[PDB]
Every structure is written in C-alpha cells, then in structure tokens.
Design a protein around this ligand. Structure first.
Ligand SMILES: *[C@@H]1O[C@H](CO)[C@@H](O[C@@H]2O[C@H](CO)[C@@H](O[C@@H]3O[C@H](CO)[C@@H](O)[C@H](O)[C@@H]3O)[C@H](O)[C@H]2NC(C)=O)[C@H](O)[C@H]1NC(C)=O
Ligand SMILES: *[C@@H]1O[C@H](CO)[C@@H](O[C@@H]2O[C@H](CO)[C@@H](O[C@@H]3O[C@H](CO)[C@@H](O)[C@H](O)[C@@H]3O)[C@H](O)[C@H]2NC(C)=O)[C@H](O)[C@H]1NC(C)=O
Ligand SMILES: *[C@@H]1O[C@H](CO)[C@@H](O[C@@H]2O[C@H](CO)[C@@H](O[C@@H]3O[C@H](CO)[C@@H](O)[C@H](O)[C@@H]3O)[C@H](O)[C@H]2NC(C)=O)[C@H](O)[C@H]1NC(C)=O
Ligand SMILES: *[C@@H]1O[C@H](CO)[C@@H](O[C@@H]2O[C@H](CO)[C@@H](O[C@@H]3O[C@H](CO)[C@@H](O)[C@H](O)[C@@H]3O)[C@H](O)[C@H]2NC(C)=O)[C@H](O)[C@H]1NC(C)=O
Ligand SMILES: *[C@@H]1O[C@H](CO)[C@@H](O[C@@H]2O[C@H](CO)[C@@H](O[C@@H]3O[C@H](CO)[C@@H](O)[C@H](O)[C@@H]3O)[C@H](O)[C@H]2NC(C)=O)[C@H](O)[C@H]1NC(C)=O
Ligand SMILES: *[C@@H]1O[C@H](CO)[C@@H](O[C@@H]2O[C@H](CO)[C@@H](O[C@@H]3O[C@H](CO)[C@@H](O)[C@H](O)[C@@H]3O)[C@H](O)[C@H]2NC(C)=O)[C@H](O)[C@H]1NC(C)=O
Ligand SMILES: *[C@@H]1O[C@H](CO)[C@@H](O[C@@H]2O[C@H](CO)[C@@H](O[C@@H]3O[C@H](CO)[C@@H](O)[C@H](O)[C@@H]3O)[C@H](O)[C@H]2NC(C)=O)[C@H](O)[C@H]1NC(C)=O
Ligand SMILES: *[C@@H]1O[C@H](CO)[C@@H](O[C@@H]2O[C@H](CO)[C@@H](O[C@@H]3O[C@H](CO)[C@@H](O)[C@H](O)[C@@H]3O)[C@H](O)[C@H]2NC(C)=O)[C@H](O)[C@H]1NC(C)=O
Ligand SMILES: *[C@@H]1O[C@H](CO)[C@@H](O[C@@H]2O[C@H](CO)[C@@H](O[C@@H]3O[C@H](CO)[C@@H](O)[C@H](O)[C@@H]3O)[C@H](O)[C@H]2NC(C)=O)[C@H](O)[C@H]1NC(C)=O
Ligand SMILES: *[C@@H]1O[C@H](CO)[C@@H](O[C@@H]2O[C@H](CO)[C@@H](O[C@@H]3O[C@H](CO)[C@@H](O)[C@H](O)[C@@H]3O)[C@H](O)[C@H]2NC(C)=O)[C@H](O)[C@H]1NC(C)=O
Ligand SMILES: *[C@@H]1O[C@H](CO)[C@@H](O[C@@H]2O[C@H](CO)[C@@H](O[C@@H]3O[C@H](CO)[C@@H](O)[C@H](O)[C@@H]3O)[C@H](O)[C@H]2NC(C)=O)[C@H](O)[C@H]1NC(C)=O
Ligand SMILES: *[C@@H]1O[C@H](CO)[C@@H](O)[C@H](O)[C@H]1NC(C)=O
Ligand SMILES: *[C@@H]1O[C@H](CO)[C@@H](O)[C@H](O)[C@H]1NC(C)=O
Ligand SMILES: *[C@@H]1O[C@H](CO)[C@@H](O)[C@H](O)[C@H]1NC(C)=O
Lengths: 153, 449, 153, 153
C-alpha cells in the first residue's frame, strides 16, 4: 500500500512519508540494523552437516563471517559517535548548537511537513561534517563546565 | 499508586539448555613440547591451570547423557584431528604391486609371511628387488610359489603414519565459549538420566584422554561409590550397557618379538619402513590379567545386574559371537602397534544367587582402517624391539539377549558399536547451558519525567 | 559451599538463592558474560607456534573465532534491547509500565522472598513478548513528550 | 613540535604534556581507538580484486580478520567496565569514592600541573585493582538506594 502513517510496522516502510510522521517509526529501523544477524547465526556452520567433506565449500563461509564483523563494527561506531556528542541513551536528542540557516534556508514547517528524509539528506550532505564538528565541541566543553560546577562544592 | 510496576534487571542468574561449539584446551607442558610429537595439542590451546568449580547452592536439574551434544562434538573433533595428523605423511601407493611370498623360518604360528617385490629407487629409470615381512592379515593371495598383493590394494591407497607422530592419548579439556557455562553433576550415585540434586558450574572439563578400544575401556575415570551400570533403556536389547568399575583391574600386554625396522626409498625424499627382520625366536603377542581380581570384579557387576533382573536369574557371560575380527575381539593401540585379542578367557562364566593370571592371545595388523571409513586405510610402521603396555581396565561394554531357553534372560556378551560411547563414558556427568541475563519482574517503584 | 549469601562471589553461585538476595550479585554475571573471552584471546595461536603445516589445523581456529563473534554480538544485542526501553546506563530500571497481574497473580512478598530466578522465568516466559512490546512503546512516546516540554518552555 | 597545548588535533599528540592540559584531547584518542578499522575494512577483500588464484593467500587473510575481532572486543570490554561504575555515557565522571592519599601522597596541583599521564600510570598501577573494586561497590549500592528513593513514592 502507499500513503502516510501506515507501513511503520515494517522495516523501511515509512521511507516515502514526510519527516514529521516518519519520526515515530525510528525504533524499527534501529532494531533491524543489527538483530538481522539472526539470518546468519541460525545457520553458519562448518562440515559434517548437510556437507560431507568438501571442506573448502565451508571455509568459503569466511564470506558470511566477514559480513557479521562488518555489521557489528558499523553499529558500534554509530553508538560511539552518538556517545561523544553526549547523546548515548536516546533515539532523539536536543543539543545546544544553534541552526545556522546557511546550511539550509528552509522554514520549520516545510522540513517536517513536506519533505521525506531522503529529500532532506540531499541538502545537509553538503554541511554534515561541519555539524558533527560543532556538536563534538559543544559537548566537550559542557563535560568540563559540569565538572567545575561540581568542583565548586 | 499501590499497584506494582515492571522493573528490568541485567545479569540475573538464569540459563537455558543449548547447542554450542565447545573449544578444546590442552595442558601447557604437552603444548611446550612444540611441533607435534602428538596431535591435538598443536591446535588445542594451552589451559588455564585454574579450573575453578563453584557449587551452585540449592540447585537441582535434569541431566541426560544419551541426548548430550558434546559427545558428538568429541567424536567429530577426534576424526578431524586424526586425519590431519596423517595428511602431511607419505602416500604409500607404489607398494600396491605383485608380491612373491613364503612362510617365515625361525620359529604355534603361520601368521608371518616373507615377501619379495620390485620397487622404484629415487631415480625414475631405476628399480630394485627388495623384501619384507607382513602378517597373514595384511596380504591376499592374487594367484609354483604363491603370489600376493596387499589387502587394501583393490579398494584404496594408504598413507604411512609418520614415525615422529605418536598415537599416545594426551589429556584434553573442553571449555565453554563466553556467555555459556558447563554444568557438572556432582552426585556419586548418578546413573546418566534424571534430576541431579547437587551441581557445580565449571569453565572447563576434566582432562579427558582420547583412548580408543572395542569390547572394554581402559585408562578412563572410575566412580567411587559402587560399580555403575547404565543404559538408555536396559530392557531394549539393541541398546548397550556401559559398566564403570569401583576400582581398576590391571592388564599387562606384550609383543615378545625383537623386531627390526628397515628403510626403503620409494622416491626422491620418500621412504617406506619395511619390517626388516625378527631376531631370536618368533613368539605370540598376548595379554595377562589376574584371575582372582577379575573373578571378584565380575562378582561385583553381577550383584548390580541382579537389581534390574529379578533375584535368582541365572546371570551368565559368553564371548563376542560371530561377525568379523573387529567385533569378535578386544582392540587397542599399544606403544605405536595395533592389537586384536579374543577375550573368551574373561567372558566365560555363570552365576547363581547363593593368585595367578588369565592369559589371552592377540594378533597384529600393519594396515588399519579406523571408524569403518571405507577409503581411509592407513599403514602403521613397524616399531623397534620388544614392546609392552600396562593399563587400568576402567570399565566394559555389555550387550544382552532375549530369554536364552528359560529362567535366564541374561546371556551377556562384550558389545561395541561406533567408538562414540567411549566418549559417553567420560562425558557421563557434564551438560552445557546458555546464560539469559535479562529479567523483568514487578516491584513498587516508578520513574518520573 | 551450599547456602544463601555464601557463593555469590563466584559466577552463577547465587542461582538457588531467592530473588531478593540474588539481586545484589548482578554485576558478576554481567562481567563474566563478555570478559570470559580472556580464556580465548590469551591462548588462540597459529602457524610456527605449536604447529607446522597440517594447515587445516590452523584454519580449525575458525571454531574459536566464530565463538568470539557470536559472544560479542549476542552481548551487543542486549545493550540495544535494554537501550530502546530508555534504560541503557543501568543494571536496574524502574519503568512506567504497570504490572498486569494477569501475567502472575503472586504478591510482592512471595516473588522476592520465596522464588529463585530460575523459577520466576518459567512463569513470565508466557507473557514476556507482551511486556517487551509495552516497554518499547512506553519509552517511544516518553522521548516525544520530553521533546515537546523542552520546546513549549 | 615540542610544547604544551599544540598537537592536540593529532592522535597521541598530547602525550608529553601535563595531565591538566592533556584532558582537552580525550575525544581524539577515543575516536581512533575503534574507527581506525577504516584502514582494514577499506582493503580486506576476498572475491576478485586483483586476486583470483593462490587463494591460500586470502585464507592467510585470517590474520587481518583476527585483528578486527580483537579491536571491537577490547573496546567493548572498556565500555562494559566504564558502564558498571555508573558512568557509561561520558568521557569524564565524578564518583563517590574518596581518594586515600596512601595511593599517592602528591598534592592536587602537582598531579594536574607537573606530571604527564604516562608518569601518573607508573604510580597508580600499584592500586588500580583496589580503586576499580571500590568504584564497583560504590555504584552497586547506589542503584539500590535510588530504587528505594523511587519506591518510597
Ligand atoms: C506521499 O508522500 C508525500 C511526501 O513525500 C506526502 O505529502 C504530504 O504530506 C502531508 C503531511 O504533512 C499530508 O497531510 C496528511 O495527508 C493524509 C493523506 O492525504 C491525510 O489523511 C491527512 O489529513 C493530512 O492531509 C499531505 O496530504 C501530503 N500531500 C500534500 C500535497 O501536501 C503524502 O502524504 C503521501 N501520500 C499520501 C496519500 O499520504
Ligand atoms: C625372507 O626372504 C629373504 C629373501 O629370500 C631371505 O633373505 C636371504 O636369506 C639368505 C639365507 O637364507 C641370505 O644368504 C646368506 O647371506 C650371508 C651373508 O653374510 C652369507 O654368509 C650366507 O652364505 C648366505 O649367502 C641372504 O643374504 C638374504 N638376503 C637376500 C636379499 O637374499 C630371508 O632369509 C627370509 N627370512 C627372513 C627371516 O628374512
Ligand atoms: C623383479 O623384477 C625382475 C625383472 O623384471 C623379475 O624377474 C623376471 O620375472 C619374469 C616373470 O616371472 C621371469 O619370466 C620367465 O622367464 C622364463 C625364462 O625366460 C620363461 O620360461 C617364463 O615363461 C617367464 O617368461 C624372468 O625370468 C625373470 N628374470 C628376468 C631377468 O627377467 C622379477 O619377477 C621381479 N620380482 C621379484 C620378486 O624379483
Ligand atoms: C536412572 O535413575 C532415575 C532416578 O534417579 C530413574 O528415574 C525413574 O525413571 C522411570 C522411567 O524411566 C520412572 O518410571 C515412571 O514412574 C511413573 C510414576 O508416576 C509411572 O507412572 C510410569 O509408568 C513409570 O513407571 C520413575 O518414576 C523414575 N524414578 C525412580 C525413583 O525410579 C531412571 O529410570 C534410571 N534409569 C536407568 C536406565 O536406570
Ligand atoms: C603373562 O603370563 C605368562 C604365564 O604366567 C607369563 O609367562 C611366563 O614367563 C616367565 C618369565 O619370562 C617364563 O619363565 C622362563 O621360561 C623359560 C623357558 O622355560 C626359561 O628358559 C627361563 O629361565 C624362565 O624360567 C615362564 O616359562 C612363562 N610361563 C609360561 C607358562 O609361558 C608371562 O611372563 C606373563 N607376563 C607378560 C608380560 O606376558
Ligand atoms: C567363542 O567361544 C567358542 C567356545 O570356546 C569358540 O568355539 C570354537 O571355535 C573354533 C574356531 O574358532 C573351533 O575350532 C575348530 O575345531 C574343530 C574340531 O572341534 C575343527 O574341525 C575346526 O577345523 C576348527 O579348527 C571349535 O570347534 C569351536 N568349539 C570349541 C569347543 O572349541 C568360538 O570360536 C569363540 N569365538 C570367538 C571369536 O571368541
Ligand atoms: C594406559 O596408560 C599407561 C601409562 O601411561 C600407558 O603405558 C605406558 O607407560 C610407560 C611408563 O610410563 C611409558 O614408557 C615410556 O616410553 C617412552 C618410549 O616410548 C620412554 O621414552 C620413557 O622413558 C618411558 O619408558 C609408555 O610410553 C606408555 N605407553 C604409551 C602408549 O603411552 C598405556 O599405553 C595406556 N594404555 C593404552 C591402551 O594406551
Ligand atoms: C581364542 O579363540 C579360539 C577360537 O579361535 C578359542 O577356542 C579354542 O580353539 C582351539 C582350536 O583353534 C580348540 O582346540 C581343539 O581342542 C580339542 C581337544 O579335544 C581338539 O579335539 C580339537 O581338534 C581342537 O584342537 C580349543 O579347544 C578352543 N578352546 C576351548 C575353550 O575349547 C580359544 O579358547 C580362545 N582363547 C581363550 C583364552 O579362550
Ligand atoms: C569356559 O567355561 C567352561 C565351563 O562352562 C570350561 O569347561 C572345562 O573347564 C576345564 C578347566 O578349565 C577344562 O580343562 C580340562 O578339564 C578336565 C576335567 O575332567 C581335566 O581332566 C583336564 O585335565 C583339563 O583340566 C575343560 O577342557 C573344559 N571343558 C569344556 C567342555 O570346555 C572351559 O575351560 C572354559 N574355557 C575358558 C578358556 O575359560
Ligand atoms: C536454600 O534456599 C532457601 C530458599 O529457597 C534458603 O531458605 C531460607 O530462606 C528464607 C527466606 O525465604 C530465609 O529467611 C530469613 O532469614 C533471616 C536469618 O535467619 C531472618 O532474619 C529473616 O527474618 C528471614 O527469616 C532463611 O534464612 C533461609 N534459611 C533457612 C535455614 O531457613 C536457604 O538459606 C538456602 N540454603 C542454605 C543452606 O542456606
Ligand atoms: C614539556 O612537558 C613538560 C611536562 O612533561 C611541561 O612542563 C611544565 O608544564 C607547565 C604547565 O603546568 C608549564 O607552564 C606553562 O608553559 C607554557 C609553555 O611554556 C606557557 O605558555 C605558560 O605560561 C606556562 O608557563 C611550564 O612552563 C613547564 N615547565 C616547568 C619548568 O614547569 C612543559 O610545559 C612542556 N614544554 C613546553 C615548552 O611547553
Ligand atoms: C606354510 O608353507 C607351506 C609350503 O610353502 C604352505 O603350503 C602353507 O600354506 C603355509 N602355511 C600357511 C598357514 O600359510
Ligand atoms: C571365583 O570363581 C568361582 C567359579 O566361577 C566362584 O565360585 C567364586 O564365587 C568366584 N569368586 C568370588 C569372590 O565370587
Ligand atoms: C532381591 O534382590 C534385591 C537387590 O539385590 C534385594 O534388595 C532383595 O532383598 C532380594 N530379595 C530376595 C527375596 O532375595
């Protein structure tokens, strides 16, 4: 089916809906980023199973095994990067960096109410490595400000 | 509000039963004897010398040694470790050639044949007349003098076992991968199937040693309480009975020939170890066990079998009736030489509910074929001089028959099967479980926004 | 050896103690669930060392490496599943899902004071896939309610 | 260069500077502790890619894969250990364990203002296994005191 607010109970099913309504599904796209390794860990196995000898057709299993370490390592790197911005516990964060509208001139309605996330990706992809810099620095000084504001005890 | 709220805990002490790949660890002094005087230790990583049991207080849960997964991993590991110990060694293919033969001279036995044949030197264009001794079991009459081939030579090639690699069984430990635990049933009266009322966890097993033998099993571990007898059902004849003794009974075995190895170059850097000569008198290989302590030990296993079979049932033993050599005999490797012995000296007695040694003869083979794998012949080289072994007979395998005429339902015979239940003898008390660390449970506490 | 409070300084040693007293030992299973990999990374070794040629017995080490990737990945999935309930920082959480006493009628005393965790498992394993669904949704709306509050101020 | 405060944009670049000024760098060490796997995953490739025979040499690639599973696993163990002290989201924590100056007699100025972190390590490596034990137990009771403070509602 096609519309808004419907297929959010399946993986990626929201993707053509506008950014506002797509904000509710995030847990599904998140859960399935890693737990899909169930399609691997149920069945990766050496010889003596459906196989008898021909051991190389199971050491060929380095294809399937390499895909697993790449998947956890991408996941874990995202969780690091979300950690160093001071945001580790959460699917959403508010953060103290003001939006420089030179990164996009667009108003608060049209971003949430008209665009898909795929349409928004094509704008801020020019500026994202600035924004990750500002987030890191804003958190890094905040950790030290908090430490002083306890150290004044 | 007075009603309860769900609260989540991590690292709650809970587990469930699971299939998982155990990893093997070997004791460090064998590992420090690097580059494989024996197999397994070259791959089986060094142990931590701290095994560290912990008693799981108040615990009680069902073990079943018949449906246990780790026996099948042991069986599959041992086969793989065996093959790779042979894979680097010389393929003996050029020996599959026509032999001229005659009986040996300097001896009762007709078991040794003396055989002559043509063999390639290292130089491709040059070949030699050469001769060696073989057992009557290694050769077949292909046919004036009689003329022969090796037994395997119509069905497969063979690999010569490398002389630097010993068949002696080192201790092996099986260890749990992270987020799994081994459980060990501690109860000294455990029979292999039921709720064990006292348990420990441990990170890694006993030093299990991978011996291999047919009708009876030896150098393995033995229970402290009583002779234990156990089976997947007992009453169904097609199931084995595993018997584990309360004490060892001690066997001496010998090969009294002063044996001489000779080396033949098959090719450029390839050599075959011929049986060269037997000096002194030729004499039979054989084994001894004390008639007194053997008779006493059967006197104990009979008292156990009476618990399952009435009272004055006429329990009796007989030899391993019929079939080929490998079911009809007790079989093992001693010192790097393979034995086959007819145990009817032991299993020939009858019982009613009221100082010197047995000597049982043996036979030897140079070609062997383990786990009945049709293509995997291998050739074990001759070993120098007189050789002998001492072992603890730990326990034995029995098979039953239906009502033999009337009264008795208990003609027992020394059994066998796949080698797998030799592992089930040592793994009789372990189990493996997967930890489930998440838990959710109710209490009267709430978070705020 | 056998009793309450005694063996808690060892892995699983609490397992026959009642749920209240077992609740102190949770760090011990949590640590040993991953760091038991010390018994792998200390002793996994390859060619030249202990072995020369027999090359399938170096490549036999795939069993040990495959166990390691399953261990880190099965652990990492718990940190995801504990994270989306709004709870990743902690060994304990209070949460705003009410206990529907249909899942068990048993009162607050007898669950903490009588049962062991292995006994409680066998009740709630009927209902747990309801309870995980409720926990996820209870957090998913809470993230949004907080973002509106930080905005309307 | 040689100084204080200069090469903090470089991996390890702070290492000879004093513990105070070195504290601003911590993000740069933390980021390269895991994401340096970019140098591995960009080129560890089996199928085709300039190589399609002598594939013993792509099974010899198990050395390069073994280093990846070590790196993710060693990092993930730090995140566990930093988690159970009640500190998982942060580069810095204040904590409720009092400093027994038997662990070092040195005053608060000279530790932050004179020493490098490499000099400090060589003192506290006597007492570190005490301090980790105290941190663990200090948190383990703090979780329970908070559960009661929520339960007295
Ligand atoms: C197909 O995707 C597009 C974006 O890629 C959606 O565009 C517009 O999104 C807004 C939400 O801010 C829609 O408003 C709501 O739509 C539904 C269905 O029409 C209606 O039930 C609600 O009352 C509300 O009007 C808006 O209609 C929509 N179109 C325009 C021209 O703005 C679009 O929603 C997606 N298609 C459908 C049929 O949902
Ligand atoms: C097995 O068969 C082989 C080959 O037929 C026998 O080996 C040969 O035995 C004869 C004696 O029966 C040897 O000849 C004697 O050699 C000595 C050398 O000092 C010499 O003094 C004697 O006058 C006589 O020539 C012969 O060397 C030996 N080898 C060959 C290649 O012919 C063997 O006897 C049979 N039995 C055993 C137990 O090996
Ligand atoms: C080792 O290699 C040698 C050389 O190939 C073999 O010796 C030869 O064996 C053949 C077949 O038995 C003999 O053939 C017979 O010769 C007589 C006389 O010519 C003839 O009447 C028969 O009909 C038959 O053709 C041959 O004589 C013999 N010697 C030579 C010098 O060729 C030998 O059999 C191989 N094996 C052993 C164990 O030595
Ligand atoms: C090994 O030892 C365990 C006890 O540690 C033995 O457990 C017994 O198992 C049998 C079935 O194999 C049970 O029999 C059943 O009992 C119920 C009673 O309600 C009856 O309705 C069934 O018709 C059947 O007879 C038995 O209760 C159970 N417990 C005891 C104390 O015997 C197990 O049989 C032993 N296995 C061997 C091979 O020795
Ligand atoms: C296994 O049991 C058999 C039977 O008890 C043992 O055989 C006996 O061994 C002794 C020592 O070797 C023999 O004594 C020697 O006999 C020769 C020939 O008569 C003589 O020249 C020597 O001076 C000495 O007296 C004894 O005859 C022999 N008995 C029999 C009936 O064969 C055997 O040693 C036991 N042990 C092993 C490891 O097999
Ligand atoms: C199991 O035990 C029985 C009884 O001890 C063994 O039976 C005996 O088997 C042998 C052949 O292995 C028979 O030997 C022969 O003797 C007859 C004359 O009696 C002769 O004509 C034959 O040519 C042959 O040489 C023997 O008759 C037979 N019975 C007795 C009383 O000895 C049986 O072999 C044992 N099987 C195993 C594998 O232990
Ligand atoms: C059951 O276990 C015993 C005890 O380990 C095995 O018998 C053997 O015991 C002797 C004495 O420890 C070993 O002797 C040694 O032999 C080497 C040369 O091979 C030598 O360098 C040493 O100085 C010492 O004399 C003997 O090697 C050992 N045999 C084996 C095969 O390990 C017995 O073999 C075991 N049972 C079975 C069925 O293997
Ligand atoms: C190991 O296996 C053999 C069967 O292969 C067992 O049976 C024995 O076999 C021999 C013949 O090979 C029997 O000899 C017979 O003796 C009578 C004497 O009256 C004679 O008339 C026959 O012509 C023949 O020579 C021998 O009797 C038989 N054993 C028994 C107990 O009858 C052998 O017993 C097995 N070894 C052990 C230690 O049990
Ligand atoms: C297997 O068990 C049978 C009994 O079920 C044994 O039967 C007989 O046992 C005796 C002593 O072992 C054998 O020796 C001979 O006994 C006569 C008795 O008159 C004696 O005069 C002779 O001097 C000699 O000692 C006897 O041959 C044997 N008879 C039969 C029918 O087997 C049998 O010996 C047992 N076999 C083994 C290897 O244990
Ligand atoms: C084996 O586990 C059982 C529980 O499954 C333990 O039994 C008893 O458990 C109760 C709580 O359900 C304990 O009661 C409390 O004891 C303290 C000190 O006596 C008292 O101040 C409290 O008011 C309350 O009564 C009880 O101590 C405990 N033990 C006994 C002997 O009743 C049992 O402790 C575990 N086994 C062993 C050997 O510890
Ligand atoms: C080389 O590293 C050493 C420590 O391993 C530094 O030692 C001392 O560190 C203090 C900071 O507490 C320095 O004070 C500040 O230095 C900078 C640069 O000279 C200056 O801009 C500030 O006004 C302040 O003086 C102190 O100078 C330094 N030396 C002593 C004797 O305490 C050292 O700073 C590093 N080298 C350089 C050139 O920075
Ligand atoms: C012993 O030698 C003779 C004559 O060569 C032969 O007939 C007999 O079959 C041989 N015996 C055995 C058991 O091979
Ligand atoms: C020894 O064997 C005889 C005959 O089988 C038997 O009478 C005796 O009871 C056995 N010894 C013991 C202690 O049972
Ligand atoms: C029957 O055998 C059992 C086990 O040995 C024993 O408890 C019982 O007393 C015996 N009964 C009779 C009548 O012999």
């Amino acid at each position: 089916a096609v519309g808004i607010g419907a297929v959010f109970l399946g993986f990626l099913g929201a993707a053509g809906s506008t950014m506002g309504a797509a904000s509710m599904t995030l847990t599904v796209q998140a859960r399935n980023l890693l737990s899909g390794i169930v399609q691997q860990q149920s069945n990766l196995l050496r010889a003596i199973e459906a196989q008898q000898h021909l051991l190389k057709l199971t050491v060929w299993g380095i294809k399937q095994l390499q895909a697993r370490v790449l998947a956890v390592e991408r996941y874990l790197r995202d969780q690091q990067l979300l950690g160093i911005w001071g945001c580790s516990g959460k699917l959403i964060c508010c953060t103290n960096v003001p939006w420089n509208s030179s990164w996009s001139n667009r108003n608060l309605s049209e971003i949430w109410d008209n665009m898909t996330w795929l349409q928004w990706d094509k704008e801020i992809s020019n500026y994202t490595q600035i924004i990750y810099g500002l987030l890191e620095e804003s958190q890094n000084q905040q950790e030290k400000n908090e430490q002083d504001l306890l150290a004044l005890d | 509000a007075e009603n309860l709220w769900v609260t989540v805990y991590y690292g709650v002490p809970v587990w469930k039963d699971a299939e998982t790949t155990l990893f093997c660890a070997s004791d460090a002094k064998a590992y420090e004897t690097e580059k494989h005087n024996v197999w397994a230790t070259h791959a089986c990583v060094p142990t931590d010398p701290n095994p560290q049991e912990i008693h799981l207080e108040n615990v009680t849960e069902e073990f079943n040694m018949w449906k246990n997964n780790m026996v099948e991993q042991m069986h599959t590991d041992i086969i793989s470790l065996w093959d790779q110990s042979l894979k680097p060694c010389v393929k003996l293919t050029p020996l599959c050639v026509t032999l001229q033969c005659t009986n040996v001279t300097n001896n009762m036995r007709g078991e040794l044949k003396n055989c002559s044949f043509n063999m390639t030197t290292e130089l491709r264009d040059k070949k030699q007349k050469v001769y060696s001794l073989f057992y009557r079991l290694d050769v077949v009459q292909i046919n004036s003098n009689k003329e022969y081939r090796l037994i395997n030579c119509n069905t497969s090639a063979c690999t010569q076992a490398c002389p630097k690699v010993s068949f002696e069984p080192i201790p092996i430990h099986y260890c749990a991968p992270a987020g799994f635990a081994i459980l060990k049933c501690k109860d000294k009266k455990f029979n292999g199937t039921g709720p064990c009322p006292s348990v420990s966890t441990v990170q890694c097993t006993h030093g299990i040693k991978p011996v291999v033998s047919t009708q009876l099993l030896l150098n393995g571990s033995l229970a402290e309480e009583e002779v234990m007898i156990r089976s997947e059902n007992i009453t169904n004849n097609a199931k084995n009975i595993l018997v584990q003794f309360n004490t060892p009974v001690q066997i001496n075995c010998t090969r009294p020939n002063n044996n001489t190895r000779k080396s033949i170059r098959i090719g450029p850097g390839q050599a075959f170890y011929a049986t060269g000569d037997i000096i002194g008198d030729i004499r039979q290989a054989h084994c001894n066990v004390s008639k007194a302590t053997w008779n006493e030990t059967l006197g104990k296993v009979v008292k156990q079998l009476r618990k399952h079979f009435g009272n004055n049932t006429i329990i009796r033993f007989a030899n391993s009736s019929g079939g080929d050599l490998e079911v009809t005999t007790h079989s093992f490797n001693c010192g790097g030489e393979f034995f086959y012995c007819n145990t009817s000296g032991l299993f020939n007695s009858t019982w009613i509910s009221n100082n010197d040694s047995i000597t049982l003869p043996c036979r030897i083979k140079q070609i062997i074929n383990m786990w009945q794998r049709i293509g995997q012949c291998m050739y074990a080289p001759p070993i120098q001089g007189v050789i002998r072994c001492v072992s603890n007979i730990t326990g034995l395998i029995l098979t039953r028959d239906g009502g033999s005429t009337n009264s008795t339902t208990e003609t027992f015979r020394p059994g066998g099967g796949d080698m797998r239940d030799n592992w089930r003898s040592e793994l009789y008390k372990y189990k493996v479980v997967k930890i489930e660390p998440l838990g959710v449970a109710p209490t009267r506490c709430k978070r705020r926004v």
